[PDB]
Design a protein around this ligand. Sequence first.
Ligand SMILES: [Cu+2]
Ligand SMILES: [Cu+2]
Ligand code: NA
Ligand code: NA
Lengths: 105, 105, 125, 124, 375, 375
Amino acid sequence: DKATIPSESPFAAAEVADGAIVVDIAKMKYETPELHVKVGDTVTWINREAMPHNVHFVAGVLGEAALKGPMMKKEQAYSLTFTEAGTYDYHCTPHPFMRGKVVVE
Amino acid sequence: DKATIPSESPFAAAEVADGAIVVDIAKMKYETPELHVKVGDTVTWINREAMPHNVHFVAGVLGEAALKGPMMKKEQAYSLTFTEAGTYDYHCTPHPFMRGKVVVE
Amino acid sequence: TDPRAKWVPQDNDIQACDYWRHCSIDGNICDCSGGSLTNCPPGTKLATASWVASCYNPTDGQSYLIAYRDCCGYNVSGRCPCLNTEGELPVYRPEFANDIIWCFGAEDDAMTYHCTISPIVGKAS
Amino acid sequence: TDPRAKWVPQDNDIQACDYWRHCSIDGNICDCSGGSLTNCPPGTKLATASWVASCYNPTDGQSYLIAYRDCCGYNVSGRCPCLNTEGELPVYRPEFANDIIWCFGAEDDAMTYHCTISPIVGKA
Amino acid sequence: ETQGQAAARAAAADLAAGQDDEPRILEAPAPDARRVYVNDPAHFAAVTQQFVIDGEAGRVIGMIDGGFLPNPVVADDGSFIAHASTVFSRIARGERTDYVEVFDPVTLLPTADIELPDAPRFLVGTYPWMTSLTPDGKTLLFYQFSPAPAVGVVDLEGKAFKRMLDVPDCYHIFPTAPDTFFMHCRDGSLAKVAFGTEGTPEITHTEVFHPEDEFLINHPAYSQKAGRLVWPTYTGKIHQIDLSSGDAKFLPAVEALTEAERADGWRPGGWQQVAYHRALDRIYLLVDQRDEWRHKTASRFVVVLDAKTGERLAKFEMGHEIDSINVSQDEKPLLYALSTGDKTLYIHDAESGEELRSVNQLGHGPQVITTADMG
Amino acid sequence: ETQGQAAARAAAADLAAGQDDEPRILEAPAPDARRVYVNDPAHFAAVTQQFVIDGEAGRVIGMIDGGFLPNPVVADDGSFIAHASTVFSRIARGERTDYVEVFDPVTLLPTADIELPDAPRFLVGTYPWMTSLTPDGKTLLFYQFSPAPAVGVVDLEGKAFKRMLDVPDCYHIFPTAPDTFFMHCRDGSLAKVAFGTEGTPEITHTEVFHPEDEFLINHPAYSQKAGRLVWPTYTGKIHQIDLSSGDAKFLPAVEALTEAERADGWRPGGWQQVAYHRALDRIYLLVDQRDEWRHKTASRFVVVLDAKTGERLAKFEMGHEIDSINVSQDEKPLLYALSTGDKTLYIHDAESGEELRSVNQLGHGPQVITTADMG
Ligand SMILES: [Cu+2]
Ligand SMILES: [Cu+2]
Ligand code: NA
Ligand code: NA
């Protein structure tokens, strides 16, 4: 499958396009609990703080396997391109209290 | 299954009848290592030493489960009634070099 | 204190390694984990077969045959460890060999070692 | 050593419990079972997620964020055990809580505790 | 005269009398108010041990094996003990199995073995209130941390796993009814969770009862029978919550240490830092002089205080490096003082503070003392 | 602690150079002649540990977990290591599984897991020659004591248990070929066992070579590459059997202690009491002054003698209570001296006997040292 990965590893926040779909991460929170995008859109999470974070979709959400993204350090970013309509929940691996969803329409 | 157990636990040997079929145990050996009896015969093992011994028949010899006889202390006895013709090997649980055979005809 | 000094039995404290019946014990004293001198702790399985040794009793000056039967089906107790080898022979004389886990015959085919009991089974003279 | 005295970091020996990066370690130093300061021993699985702590480096006077990722899928090493708690918070602030087995994300879904590494993940 | 010597006397008498040794498997004595359990998480070892102790005699009366960081529970009424535990097919790797076992408290035999699907136990240094019995003894509740916060429901009566409850970002489980428990939340509120056989559980929150920078320890004392939850902070301030009505009522906050002691470096510290005696309405707290971030180190002192007034009733010099405390819940209670470093349970008179006896060789790193409240 | 100190210095340089930490799983350095394995049976614990050590550096370079009393083996050519091990479905009870694992000696990852039908392993304090590789490394043989004497044949090449061989009342396993191995019998003979793909083995006994009251220890040294079986008795007499031709030739018996030492109460004692260096043709034996039934206690001395002539070459005072010894098999070998009580491997120069370095914290009761004869 329901997503492709543009980049295996985190990259610099500065490499994100001026117009990109962005979810900032700061103060132990994702910016939105529920991001709305269209099929074919790429979402980019950007960690704004020193505390490492990722996004983690459990098995069966984006495909058979879990998609556990790499940990982002401060000012690092990670993307996913959503290829099928649906609603996909995620969390931050060490911080299960950080939860979001991507609604792909 | 092929044998029946007179007494579940060892009994005083002074309680064994004359001309009963007896295998003595002494000097880390079954003194009659190859015993020939008739269908229906009762064999009685008697320990003649302070070293504890038993008789032990593996799974599939006297029936589906192994018969692991109780340890006889000195001058304790233990009996088995053989109810079916065949050849039944046994050993002493702690002392697998101690071996015997009851041939039931 | 001297590990290499000759063994000296006492008959006043069963939880000590110099207790006279423990003369060829290898493991842990059951009395230190809810068993007793001659009984297994609750929950454990009592072996029927064992190694043996003749141990001298300083109280009456006689020797007795101890059967070192293991209490099995639990992880080692870790309390009152002892290792004595009075008259202990190598593995090719297993009747007197105490590195063996003497758990054969225990209920439920339990084969893990928890502790050892020291019941008398005969006179050795 | 007085267990209750203020912890005093050093930058001269990674195998001692007062090495500066070990300010919030709980477990065993991986360098003592064939890992290194920041890498897991052979055969163990490297957690990706962990608790963290800001640790003061006396060499340069800077504080660094250390990620206490566990090396997992083995019984505990039993070598170089340490327990420090600089800035350490209770379980309801898990990001700074160190009694947790920080094995999440480890290959093969390894969740047993072997040892902990002390990599730097950022400045303070 | 010691236990070992009495036992040598008795055995000598038996042998003089010519009475044969006939080995059997013993049963533990009946659970009583002075039975104490010591769990040894063994410094995160893959397998662990629980010691069942007669606290009056200071004798080990039995043992229970567990796997990796198990969570022990004990029926307040003495009828069973249980744990939630974790094993692997090849020691510490391969397939993981999480399970609950229930044991008969005198034979110590397992009477239920109930598998928990999908490895849902929270693997963490052992917190008593991460796995908890309902007051009727019919249900075991356990915490899952990851992939999302949840509480597992295990039917001990029908011997079956029931389900996982989705719960909010809260921690610890304090059962107040056959179908209700409370948890403590990240934001510093409490959540009340009321659950049925099916459906969303009902979840309400109290207000936030502490500042974000006031840290409540991982080992609060909780008396299900009194419905009293006693929650120290790193400074010795004590929150208390009354849950007896089935809803949370905050009690006046108390300080366990004086301002002078605080200015002179006194802080609580250890593992099971706090105990609460129900009948006497007293709180015991492990304290010593320490830096502020040495809160898990052992303590050499215990202060005792009335839970209603906060008045200091005693201060005991324990004479050992103590990590964990607890008390029997009978009339003239024992104060249990567990040393992780000595691997020894010290057994004290709670009224005087006097050391009465000790039980050593309790595994590799014993940390958790559990008692039944049988009254 | 120069290792911990060199590491701190390296890391400091890395940080000052702004090199980021990128955590990885290491590989051990390639097996070499100075790698040494220390197994910890942990005083009969349900789970156990092996420590892989670089003897030259005095550094733990890896570990392997095992079950209840496993038997470790190490390929002489450094190509793999393996053990036969035992686990249970509920820590120490429930269903028993016996199995062989083979591991890559650099990643330490299991490359085979071969279950042994019907739980046939002999559960006994660890004797190296109760589980043995054939010289090509394709086969592992292990001893079954009960219900009857037997040798299990495990094909490591095909990764499959093959069969159990019936053998006489004999103990230990000393392979000389894909098809042949020797054992030591109750009556004091050796048995040669020669076996094909099918059918009963051909068994040939030697003469009885020691009387019934001369006791041969549980830990003889066997150099498979030399075919040399070095077998001490309780008094330090040394039997040597040359098996290099795949038939047993008895060598002259030699006394490791002098007649005066013997009168003065010197005897061997400990666990792995004897080592043998193949290229030097030297025997090393753990000895001390001791009463005669204290044969498993630690020893403070090692005597070194010429295997061919029996000439004493050295006697070392070791400076610790040593239970086990072994040597590296390279040109100027190390003498390894393991203390079960200190849980420490002391590493000595075999020529001068001087202690060079040590590695401590080796588990709960380490007992067995294994090295590869790579050269
Ligand atoms: Cu996060
Ligand atoms: Cu026998
Ligand atoms: Na034993
Ligand atoms: Na931890």
